[PDB]
Design a binder for this molecule. Structure first.
Ligand SMILES: [Ca+2]
Ligand SMILES: [Ca+2]
Length: 182
């Protein structure tokens, strides 16, 4: 399998985020066909965090299906460094996986945020799992920012010891809030 990204150009950390059920959510109908909603805070999340992270938007769908959705999130291409798709996943024991060791990045400096435990199966130590977004307006993206800002503003040398210090990474933003007095 090919390496997927050029060598770093620069930001101290790389943030790999899934598209489907994290930034957007799609539903099909007879009346309208496929329709896609954008989560509250998505534009701000990408715009603000791009100042601290190299952002890689890693879609779980084939390019032909999600290419345009991804583009709408950053039409002028100012925030997202790279777009990857299902074609870039490796296929192992019948599941597709976002193999971070193919990103040509130091894995002490990579975070992946995904909603499908298969996607981070090869690097669970780099992962922040998220409950899939259902399309209902919520503030979960905004709540994730303080931890991500913290990682970037403290260095950080290796994100993994901190990431894996939580009781339940699915509840990371809330636990981090209780751990820190701003
Ligand atoms: Ca707090
Ligand atoms: Ca708080």
């Amino acid at each position: 399998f090919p390496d997927l990204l050029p060598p770093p150009p620069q930001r101290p950390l790389t943030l790999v985020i899934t598209l489907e059920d994290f930034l957007v959510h799609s539903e099909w109908s007879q009346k309208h066909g496929w329709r896609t909603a954008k989560r509250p805070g998505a534009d701000y999340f990408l715009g603000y965090l791009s100042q601290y992270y190299e952002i890689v938007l890693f879609s779980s769908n084939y390019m032909m299906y999600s290419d345009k959705i991804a583009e709408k999130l950053d039409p002028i291409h100012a925030f997202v460094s790279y777009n990857l798709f299902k074609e870039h996943c490796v296929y192992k024991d019948g599941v597709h996986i976002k193999d971070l060791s193919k990103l040509n990045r130091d894995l002490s400096k990579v975070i992946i945020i995904d909603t499908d435990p298969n996607s981070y199966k090869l690097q669970p130590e780099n992962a922040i799992p998220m409950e899939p977004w259902n399309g209902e307006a919520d503030d979960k993206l905004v709540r994730l920012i303080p931890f991500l800002e913290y990682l970037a503003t403290q260095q950080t040398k290796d994100v993994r010891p901190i990431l894996n210090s939580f009781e339940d990474k699915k509840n990371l933003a809330e636990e981090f809030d209780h751990r820190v007095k701003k």
